[PDB]
Amino acid sequence: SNYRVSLGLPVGAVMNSADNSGAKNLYVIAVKGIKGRLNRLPSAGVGDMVMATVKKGKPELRKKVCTGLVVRQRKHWKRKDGVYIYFEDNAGVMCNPKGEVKGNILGPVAKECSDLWPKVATNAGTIV
Amino acid sequence: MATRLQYENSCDVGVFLKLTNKYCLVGQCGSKQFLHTVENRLADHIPVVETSIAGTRIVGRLSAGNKNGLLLPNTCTDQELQQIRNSLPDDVVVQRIEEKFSALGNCIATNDYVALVHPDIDRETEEIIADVLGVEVFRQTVSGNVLVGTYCALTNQGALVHPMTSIADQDELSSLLQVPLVAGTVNRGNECVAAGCVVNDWTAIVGADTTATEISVIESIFAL
Amino acid sequence: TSLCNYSEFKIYPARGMKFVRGDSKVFHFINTKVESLFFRKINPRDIRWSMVY
Amino acid sequence: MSIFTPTNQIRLTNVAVVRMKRAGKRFEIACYKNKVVGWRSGVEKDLDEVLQTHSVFVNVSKGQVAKKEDLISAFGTDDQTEICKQILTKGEVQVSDKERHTQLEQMFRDIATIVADKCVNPETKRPYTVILIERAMKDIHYSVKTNKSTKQQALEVIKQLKEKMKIERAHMRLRFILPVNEGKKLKEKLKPLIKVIESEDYGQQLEIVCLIDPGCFREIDELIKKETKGKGSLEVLNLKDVEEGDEKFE
Amino acid sequence: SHRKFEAPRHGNLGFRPRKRAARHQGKVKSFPKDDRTQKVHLTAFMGYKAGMTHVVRDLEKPGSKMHKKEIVEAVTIIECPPMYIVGLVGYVETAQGLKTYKTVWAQHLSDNFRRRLYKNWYKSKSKKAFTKYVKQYETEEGKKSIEASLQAIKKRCSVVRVIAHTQVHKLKLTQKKAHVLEIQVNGGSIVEKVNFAVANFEKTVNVTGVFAENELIDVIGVTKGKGFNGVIKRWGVRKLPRKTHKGLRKVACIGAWHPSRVSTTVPRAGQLGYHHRVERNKKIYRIGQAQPEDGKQISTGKTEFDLTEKTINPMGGFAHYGMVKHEFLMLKGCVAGPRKRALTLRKSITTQTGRAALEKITLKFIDTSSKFGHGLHQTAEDKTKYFG
RNA sequence: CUAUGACUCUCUUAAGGUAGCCAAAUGCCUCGUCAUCUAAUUAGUGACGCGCAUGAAUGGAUCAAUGAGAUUCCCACUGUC
RNA sequence: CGCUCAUAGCGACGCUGCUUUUUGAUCCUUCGAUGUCGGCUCUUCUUAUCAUUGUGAAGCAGAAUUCACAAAGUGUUGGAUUGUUCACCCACUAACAAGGAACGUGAGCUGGGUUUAGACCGUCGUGAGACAGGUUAGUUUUACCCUACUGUUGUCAGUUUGCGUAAUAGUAGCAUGAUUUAGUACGAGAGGAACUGUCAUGCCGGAUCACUGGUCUGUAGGUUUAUUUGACAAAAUAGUGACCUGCCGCUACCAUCCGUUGGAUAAUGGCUGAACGCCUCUAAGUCAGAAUCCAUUCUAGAAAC
Secondary structure: OOOOOOOOEOOOEEEEEOOOOOEOOEEEEEEOOOOOOOOOOOOEOOOOEEEEEOOOEOHHHOOOOEEEEEEEOOOOEEOOOOOEEEOOOOEEEEEOOOOOOOOOOOOEEOOOOOOOOHHHHOOOOEEO | OEEEEOEOOEOOHHHHEEOOOOOOEEOOOOOOOHHHHHHOOOOOOOOOOOOOEOOEOOOOOOOOOOOOOOEEOOOOOHHHHHHHHHHOOOOOOOEEOOOOOOOOOOOOOOOOOEEEOOOOOOOHHHHHHHHHOOOEEEOOOOOOOOOOEOOEEEOOOOEEOOOOOOHHHHHHHHHOOOOOOEOOOOOOOOOOOOOOEEEOOOOEEEEOOOOHHHHHHHHHHHOO | OEEOOOOOOEEOOOOOEEEEOOOOOEEEEOOHHHHHHHHOOOOOOOOOOOOOO | OOOOOOOOOOOOOOOOEEEEEEOOEEEEEEEOOOOOOOOOOOOOOOOOOOEOOOOOEEEOOOOEEOOOOOOOOOOOOOOHHHHHHHHHHOOEEEOOOOHHHHHHHHHHHHOOOOOOOOOEOOOOOOOOOOHHHHHHHHOOOOOOOOOOOHHHHHHHHHHHHHHHOOOEOOEEEEEEEEOOHHHHHHHHHHOOOOEEEEEEOOOOOOEEEEEEEEOOOHHHHOOHHHHOOOOOOEEEEEEOOOOOOOOOOO | OOOOOOOOOOOOOOOOOOOOOOOOOOOOOOOOOOOOOOOOOOOEOOEEEEEEEEEEEEOOOOOOOOOOOEEEEEEEEEEOOOEEEEEEEEEEOOOOOOEEOOOEEOOOOOOOHHHOOOOOOOOOOOOOOOOOOHHHOOOOOOHHHHHHHHHHHHHHOOEEEEEEEOOOOOOOOOOOOOOEEEEEOOOOOHHHHHHHHHOOOOOEEOHHHHOOOOOEEEEEEEOOOOEEEOOOOOOOOOOOOOOOOOOOOOOOOOOOOOOOOOOOOOOOOEEEOOOEEEEEEEEEEEEEOOOOOOOOOOOOOOOOOOOOOOOOOOOOOOOOOOOOOOOEEEEEEOOOOOOOOEEEEEEOOOOOOOOOOOOOOOEEEEOOOOOOOOOOOOOHHHHHHHOO
16 A cells, blocks of 8 residues: 555564553554564564564553554654654554554554554544 | 445546536546546536646545635646636636645635644635635544545535444534534444445435445535 | 744754653754753743744 | 583474383383384284383483482382383373373364264254264363273263253154165165164165164265265154163263 | 475566776667668767756556656756767677677867776877877868778678767866767768768767657766675665674575585675666757857746746755766666766667556646755745845 | 272381472473463463372471572663664 | 264274484494574575375365375465573464485574673582572684686687587476356355456566665765865865765666467376286376476587597
8 A cells, every 4th residue: 555664663673552541551563564584573663563462561461462453653764755754652553463453542543554544544643 | 416436446526526516526547438428417506627736636525616616726736727717607706725744635625615634734725715715714633533624525405424423423523513413323334424425406426336225325414 | 944932043954953841842952052951941041042032 | 601602502302201100200202103002902013112211210301310329229229121011101291392182182083972872862863963962062061081981981971961051862763765776776885874673675665774873974874875875854753762872871 | 395485586687796896977779779760860879967956747557547647757957058069989790699890080189088998188298189189170081091090881781870079177076088989970861970970070960859848868887886795785685683693784595515616696795886887768848048158147947937037957966976066867766876976878679668658747846945954945046035 | 979089907017297388409291281471471470189200307398688690571772783 | 983884084903114304222423622592695406295296085065174195396375482492372374294415504694592711699508619400790712725616818639710509417387366157056045166268466597777665986066064275266185074965887577578289198087909718007008187208498518520
């Protein structure tokens, strides 16, 4: 669907779960789509679907391997119109395998992430 | 009427096209021409403009336009508004609001008489929306929202909320807004409403996975 | 083209550095000098090479 | 300190072991991985063959062979090929390097077989998969022992969920409806698979037969009469509880 | 045992001798394969890489996500002063390959072209290169031999190449040796190719005739010489860890005990840069006009929707270059070599008919900010009306 | 109660592991089993003990303060990656 | 066995082989010394093919899967535990195939283990001490030689130089996802494709410096610390005092661009057609056809011209 954004969330990067469902952060354990390349860490850009666990949140969901969208990151990526952009914090939002955010997203959502996934646009307040 | 449709088999057509009382916008869809099937249903009136806004394919819940004003954020391009202002003949005042706190489709649910408002809309937006839409605005959230757009779908003679919405909100939303309500949820996989259906006084392009008995439920308030 | 936020400099295509904050405000910095002086939280009216001066 | 080839290493093996503890010492011998249940059933497996070595061991991991100072004192003999028979019959099958596997995979084979025998749900009874009771048997917190027999162990796991939940512990019955022409090769597939009653076949109308079936075998028989025929065939419930299943408590 | 974890190879072996290029300017070692369907035209040229800038254009790729939308695209500016054609050379096909046949020259050889023949031009008093040759044109017992030399070419041989050379002296680098190379003519009927040769002696060929607009060309050049570089930064080898004794910027194991010599395929430290490389499919966005030596400043960097009378030159000129005052052509993406390097452009080996060959470029913006810093201005007059 | 083994004898060699403690720097099997830390743990810790081969100044159990002693984990922090 | 059906797929009871990636067996080389586990790194080879390409079979309706062939051109991962090889999980994935190279690789590294001397504990021994048991701490030396490789000059068996040819050697692009096709073929349904086209990505490769970020001896400018020149000014010393901004340059999937088309084949599907009045892809001929092979393009340019 969308382009290559600069990947700045490797495996082992905690990010703030901008989602009104119960988490306080998200620890990315692998990214869906990364294959191969000996000794390279799977990085997540924005728009990526990550497999993540929660290290801080409601205890009824705390040791499961859940799915999340990276909706903003502070590694600066240039859009292909020339303008760069970088957010304030890394962030995530929990979903299903299909990519259905069932909660409400808070904070600005990058519009390289409201592209591939429709329901990340329909729960975002600010799409930037 | 209340017809199934999908945008690239990701059935949520309620965001990639807005069907307002005038000027149905549609997304770009660098694929099969998505606007062609909706133009086979809207060649009679309500011209389709095939414009993308802000670079992004969503226009229905990133632009929240009425019959009397279309809205575009501060991320939109001057050439995209130079296409939007030209693609439709003169009936509207399309107003690019200088808001940047939000994305404008998900935060105002609009209607030809009285619209809705995400609470911290920063009253500059309130005055400019009373100028260019001329509608009353109410900074309300339903029991399943704080972002009151795109959890509810607003039209004339009809609206919708969730069955996770309390009755106390539905009665006051039938009282204050003066629009009848059904608590049905479009597209039984998800919860949100205005990602599933976009409504005119004539039709409602509806997501493809929607069950037909629920399609009858929402068409028995959208049509009549 | 657009205008810089901290200083009121003019920004041509691909000589910016756009930054979007947690309060959903977006800033367009023209280089990382302006970005450094924004993140030290100095007023633009204190420095005398900006266009706010 | 810097010898050019490092010293002797462990004696890792693939070979089963049997224990006998006599007069204060712990004597084992090396055997075959399956041919010690070929010895304690009365079946002969040629005493030369049941051993991987004939010389008696103190410790089979350390590879330590006993001596006749502590053998005439222990057994009352010193002839090793008579020692190895007493250790074989009057011992208990000890376990090699694969003990943790042949015990954990055994206790995860046991719950994946004995728990899943005949179990239907509430609410107009249907069967289901194995992983639902793999949830609901850790949920009832079952601890599995092997020395109680497997049929008795089947009758033990469902006692606890008759006590806890509302589940049925018997057979069921179905009334199969199939058309005459395109259903006889469906008849003779399940006719030597399960038991039948009321074989009522016509020419103008449909073959109606009734069943004697467990509660769990229905989900196969809902699908196998369509994936062979290729058309529609009807599942009509007959009865929900017949004895001579596990209701006799064998 | 074997290689435990499997990883791709560190480096290409299709570039493997990795030495300094013997061609100081870039050799067209293969020309586009001649079809006699087409008319006569040249197929190579020689530019000089002025600098680099970025342009803004609206994409016309239907189906993409950027479509009818602005895109900042970087472009290098290759300055192409017109090329003098100064001879022609015939090539007969033989069993061992093409061979140089008879080499007809012109009469007025420029004193910049004659500098290639002379390594010490200043010590030579009477520059006697091509002096007994040009006296063949004076008499007609020598001029007769030119035509019998030329009818040998237009009958006996198969490839017609014009020996063409540039004007380095017209753009001020510090060089007066005018870079010379053969451009093979590619048209039908050899008696038309030698016709196109001799009808261009002593006359210049502009870049706008050889290369069209909105087309893909290949750029033959010599890359930026980075000297004796170690194996990481040359091949791509993962660094050894923090604890290593003899050094961590090495290939650790350079072979097994059993071939018993180091393979030619092991990454070893050696020369980086000054490698001959070609770059295929580099689309020209704009061919710029010449600027006149008698007349006003032709606004080369003026585009549609911009309407600023400005050059392709940024503020302060191109960094480490002069100004682009002759014809240029700006093509998308980077090319081999730094600023001030001779590049041999070349028409593509096959005639591309894909998407980018059928693309049509309409630039809306050309950045002329001072790249010697971070210029926030476009023209030198906007700077004076901004801080005045 | 044929599981436990009080009780009861003989036997070498006088007696038969008391209070405690542990897969412990002491446990072969062993990556023991149950819980817990983890997404995932041959690791860590807390329990269980027929303990190949724990155990009372051959000192047993505990243990504040201290340790260029050994091990595991969370926070910070970093080119460790 | 596979409902019937030996051979779609398997296949007991037997038999015939191969391999040297297990461990044995032996003691032929080496005890005036071949540094011995694992890992990291890096290259090349093998095919006993995991994926990819082309095909053929199935109990191949579609999807998914299974068997085989030509196929080694290109891939074949991130991690928790353990020194581990092995093992076992979590997660990605087109796939996470098996292997050699002195059980590749210690003047390449590390030194976790093993494996000296210190020490503790358990069992054995009267004891010194033993353990092929557990624990803990424990020096990893030399290349400047020859060759090999990587680059760099240099001699060219009419002078100097120009522009070339291209023998020979190397060789590079591989792969995925979404979407059109299409909720269509197929199917009773559930589910649900394919060719072409389009758009992107992953990995690799070759460059590059317009942007963005990093670096900062440009000791460029500023702030400022302690001292010294009497104070101001301006300087220094503190091995570049520290901090902030930062040219040029170098740089990074941390940024950008670019990465082709022809011929002959294999597998196999076939045509004309005998042998063998019929049949037959085969015997004489012949056709299409693979990520293959050879060229094309690319890299070097020879006691060759």
